[PDB]
PDB file of C-alpha atoms in Angstrom:
ATOM      1  CA  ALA H 848     -15.860-101.094 -34.654  1.00  0.00           C
ATOM      2  CA  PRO H 849     -16.536-103.351 -31.667  1.00  0.00           C
ATOM      3  CA  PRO H 850     -17.497-106.983 -32.175  1.00  0.00           C
ATOM      4  CA  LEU H 851     -21.250-107.363 -32.256  1.00  0.00           C
ATOM      5  CA  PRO H 852     -22.660-109.326 -29.314  1.00  0.00           C
ATOM      6  CA  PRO H 853     -24.553-112.593 -29.822  1.00  0.00           C
ATOM      7  CA  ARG H 854     -28.261-112.166 -30.203  1.00  0.00           C
ATOM      8  CA  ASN H 855     -30.340-112.192 -27.072  1.00  0.00           C
ATOM      9  CA  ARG H 856     -31.957-115.358 -25.803  1.00  0.00           C
ATOM     10  CA  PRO H 857     -35.225-115.683 -27.746  1.00  0.00           C
ATOM     11  CA  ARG H 858     -38.254-115.877 -25.475  1.00  0.00           C
ATOM     12  CA  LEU H 859     -40.783-118.690 -25.744  1.00  0.00           C
TER      13      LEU H 859
ATOM     14  CA  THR F 156     -30.601 -90.615 -22.987  1.00  0.00           C
ATOM     15  CA  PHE F 157     -27.813 -92.384 -24.872  1.00  0.00           C
ATOM     16  CA  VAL F 158     -25.659 -91.390 -27.835  1.00  0.00           C
ATOM     17  CA  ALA F 159     -24.273 -93.613 -30.573  1.00  0.00           C
ATOM     18  CA  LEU F 160     -20.493 -93.950 -30.629  1.00  0.00           C
ATOM     19  CA  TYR F 161     -20.458 -95.725 -34.013  1.00  0.00           C
ATOM     20  CA  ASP F 162     -22.846 -96.053 -36.925  1.00  0.00           C
ATOM     21  CA  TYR F 163     -24.864 -99.283 -36.991  1.00  0.00           C
ATOM     22  CA  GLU F 164     -26.555-100.841 -40.025  1.00  0.00           C
ATOM     23  CA  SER F 165     -29.453-103.185 -39.204  1.00  0.00           C
ATOM     24  CA  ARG F 166     -28.787-106.879 -39.684  1.00  0.00           C
ATOM     25  CA  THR F 167     -32.393-108.007 -39.157  1.00  0.00           C
ATOM     26  CA  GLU F 168     -35.612-106.186 -39.930  1.00  0.00           C
ATOM     27  CA  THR F 169     -36.386-105.271 -36.290  1.00  0.00           C
ATOM     28  CA  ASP F 170     -32.966-103.820 -35.594  1.00  0.00           C
ATOM     29  CA  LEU F 171     -32.638-100.037 -35.483  1.00  0.00           C
ATOM     30  CA  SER F 172     -30.024 -98.499 -37.787  1.00  0.00           C
ATOM     31  CA  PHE F 173     -28.356 -95.362 -36.453  1.00  0.00           C
ATOM     32  CA  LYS F 174     -25.506 -92.890 -36.927  1.00  0.00           C
ATOM     33  CA  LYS F 175     -22.689 -91.819 -34.645  1.00  0.00           C
ATOM     34  CA  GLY F 176     -23.951 -88.908 -32.552  1.00  0.00           C
ATOM     35  CA  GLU F 177     -27.612 -89.910 -32.774  1.00  0.00           C
ATOM     36  CA  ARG F 178     -29.553 -89.631 -29.520  1.00  0.00           C
ATOM     37  CA  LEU F 179     -31.399 -92.757 -28.429  1.00  0.00           C
ATOM     38  CA  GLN F 180     -33.894 -93.484 -25.667  1.00  0.00           C
ATOM     39  CA  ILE F 181     -33.354 -96.950 -24.199  1.00  0.00           C
ATOM     40  CA  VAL F 182     -36.756 -98.571 -23.832  1.00  0.00           C
ATOM     41  CA  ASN F 183     -35.854-102.154 -22.896  1.00  0.00           C
ATOM     42  CA  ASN F 184     -32.495-103.252 -21.535  1.00  0.00           C
ATOM     43  CA  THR F 185     -33.303-106.507 -19.687  1.00  0.00           C
ATOM     44  CA  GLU F 186     -33.217-109.107 -22.487  1.00  0.00           C
ATOM     45  CA  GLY F 187     -29.469-109.302 -23.145  1.00  0.00           C
ATOM     46  CA  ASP F 188     -26.756-107.414 -24.994  1.00  0.00           C
ATOM     47  CA  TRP F 189     -29.275-106.100 -27.537  1.00  0.00           C
ATOM     48  CA  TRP F 190     -31.437-103.283 -26.166  1.00  0.00           C
ATOM     49  CA  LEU F 191     -34.689-101.945 -27.561  1.00  0.00           C
ATOM     50  CA  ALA F 192     -34.037 -98.311 -28.444  1.00  0.00           C
ATOM     51  CA  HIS F 193     -36.116 -95.421 -29.771  1.00  0.00           C
ATOM     52  CA  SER F 194     -34.304 -92.852 -31.909  1.00  0.00           C
ATOM     53  CA  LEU F 195     -35.084 -89.317 -30.837  1.00  0.00           C
ATOM     54  CA  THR F 196     -33.778 -88.155 -34.212  1.00  0.00           C
ATOM     55  CA  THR F 197     -35.645 -90.454 -36.624  1.00  0.00           C
ATOM     56  CA  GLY F 198     -38.487 -91.631 -34.372  1.00  0.00           C
ATOM     57  CA  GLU F 199     -37.822 -95.261 -35.268  1.00  0.00           C
ATOM     58  CA  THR F 200     -37.574 -98.086 -32.714  1.00  0.00           C
ATOM     59  CA  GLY F 201     -35.665-101.358 -32.859  1.00  0.00           C
ATOM     60  CA  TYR F 202     -32.912-103.466 -31.331  1.00  0.00           C
ATOM     61  CA  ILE F 203     -29.362-102.158 -31.025  1.00  0.00           C
ATOM     62  CA  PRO F 204     -26.029-103.530 -29.813  1.00  0.00           C
ATOM     63  CA  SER F 205     -25.548-102.011 -26.360  1.00  0.00           C
ATOM     64  CA  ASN F 206     -21.779-101.766 -26.799  1.00  0.00           C
ATOM     65  CA  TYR F 207     -22.199 -99.241 -29.648  1.00  0.00           C
ATOM     66  CA  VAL F 208     -23.837 -96.540 -27.473  1.00  0.00           C
ATOM     67  CA  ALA F 209     -23.028 -94.686 -24.259  1.00  0.00           C
ATOM     68  CA  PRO F 210     -24.895 -92.596 -21.690  1.00  0.00           C
ATOM     69  CA  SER F 211     -25.394 -89.025 -22.791  1.00  0.00           C
ATOM     70  CA  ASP F 212     -26.714 -85.884 -21.076  1.00  0.00           C
TER      71      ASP F 212
END
């Protein structure tokens, strides 16, 4: 399976 | 709508797990590589890796 992408930028 | 190309098992509580062939509605796709999706098959909603799904009919 494809590599998972990094998590999204958390919002503040 | 989108369809899953692979299965995906949630890695955090607010992810959405899904199966290959499952139809998903994309509800937010502006926050990064992880999209908020609503499963049309299970009714559940959570984040998914956008590279595991593709546009469907």
